[PDB]
Write a protein that binds this ligand. Structure first.
Ligand SMILES: [Br-]
Ligand SMILES: [Cl-]
Ligand SMILES: [Cl-]
Length: 381
């Protein structure tokens, strides 16, 4: 058979090339690839879908699909036999999967800590909010307690994680929605009262430093590898970078206990790439057959000898999981217990974010969470 593919220039890796080469060699599917310059790809894909000339398989950005209507353009893959093998199945707002993902996640947020420092000062892995506060207290008795690094989005990762967890997958999506269409009224967001309270308490006790929050990732790495930071909350990509810089460092990773339900789910970025099937294709069956082969352990294993990042599927031997993420990989990631943090969405980025810079409201004397919500709403109007 034949299959046509549309992909981003910079995403047409040796990984995918060899994947498509195997497909032609072993499965008798002649694949023709059409690459588009990355900054142009969303424009081009939209146009080709609109005029119906789009290739059989197209690269898409998960989870939001460039705001395209998948029920118009893409095959619903939710019932394909390989869906159970996904670690974190991509979903639209109805829970349906419209692409084969190349990774389960871009970024996982966790509390990373220096196991040796914890041992030195008799600190145990915090398994609750009070244990976190106590852990910070002992560090101050003995080194910045809880370090944070700067981002290009609001709210900061720490508050984003906590808000996302209390609201859950639907609630978090709705929050981005109403923030983005400007219908939100922050004084109605009383579900956020306790997590803003927690945030405030960290500032109050000096466990997080407002003046340090603009610290670059490079600075966190520099200080962490010199035993100047006990705990860092943020992206596992930062933890990876710490280990790269100091291979012998003894790093642990656990849930940040900042909400009553923190142990239930991890947050992160699920803004991964995927391959969707063009609904109006005359070769939909062939496309679906191809994705099924691509999803197979043999192909995933070959792919991840080249492709970087976290695996998309269960039992991808060639995908390396960082040792520090080992526990969380088994407890949460492998079980799909991950949802997208509200700061990971494009709308959240300053380019002007749809979310408030809540930390900017925290001055001396500190306001209440009620006052922070009023301030957020005042800036809205
Ligand atoms: Br914030
Ligand atoms: Cl369909
Ligand atoms: Cl940096």
């Amino acid at each position: 058979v034949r299959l046509s593919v549309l992909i981003r220039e910079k995403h047409y890796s040796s990984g995918l090339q060899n994947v498509f080469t195997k497909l032609e060699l072993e499965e008798g599917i002649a694949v023709t690839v059409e690459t588009i310059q990355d900054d142009q790809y969303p424009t081009v894909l939209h146009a080709r879908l609109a005029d119906g000339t789009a290739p059989d398989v197209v690269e898409v950005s998960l989870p939001s699909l460039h705001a395209l209507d998948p029920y118009l353009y893409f095959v619903d893959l939710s019932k394909e036999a390989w869906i159970p093998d996904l670690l974190i199945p991509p979903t639209d707002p109805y829970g349906k999967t419209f692409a084969l993902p190349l990774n389960c996640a871009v970024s996982i947020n966790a509390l990373f800590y220096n196991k040796d420092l914890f041992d030195r000062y008799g600190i145990s892995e915090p398994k609750s909010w009070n244990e976190l506060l106590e852990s910070c207290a002992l560090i101050v008795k003995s080194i910045v307690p809880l370090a944070l690094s700067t981002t290009e989005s609001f709210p900061h990762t720490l508050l984003a994680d906590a808000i996302t967890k209390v609201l859950g997958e639907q609630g978090a999506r709705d929050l981005v929605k109403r923030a983005t269409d400007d219908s939100i009224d922050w004084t109605h967001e009383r579900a956020l009262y306790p997590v803003l309270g927690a945030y405030l308490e960290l500032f109050k006790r000096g466990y997080v430093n407002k003046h340090h929050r603009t610290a670059r990732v490079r600075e966190i790495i520099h200080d962490f590898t010199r035993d100047r930071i006990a705990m860092y909350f943020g992206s596992h990509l930062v933890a990876d970078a710490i280990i790269k810089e100091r291979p012998g460092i003894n790093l642990g990773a656990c849930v940040l206990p900042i909400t009553e339900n923190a142990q239930d789910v991890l947050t992160g970025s699920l803004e991964v790439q995927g391959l969707a099937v063009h609904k109006k294709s005359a070769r939909v069956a062939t496309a679906c057959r191809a994705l099924s082969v691509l999803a197979s352990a043999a192909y995933q294993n070959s792919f991840f000898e080249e492709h970087k990042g976290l695996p998309a599927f269960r039992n991808t031997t060639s995908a390396v999981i960082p040792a520090c993420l080992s526990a969380l990989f088994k407890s949460h990631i492998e079980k799909g217990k991950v949802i997208q943090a509200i700061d990971a969405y494009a709308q959240a980025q300053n380019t002007a974010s749809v979310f408030p810079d809540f930390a900017a409201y925290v001055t001396d004397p500190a306001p209440t969470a009620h006052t922070m919500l009023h301030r957020a709403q005042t800036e809205a109007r």
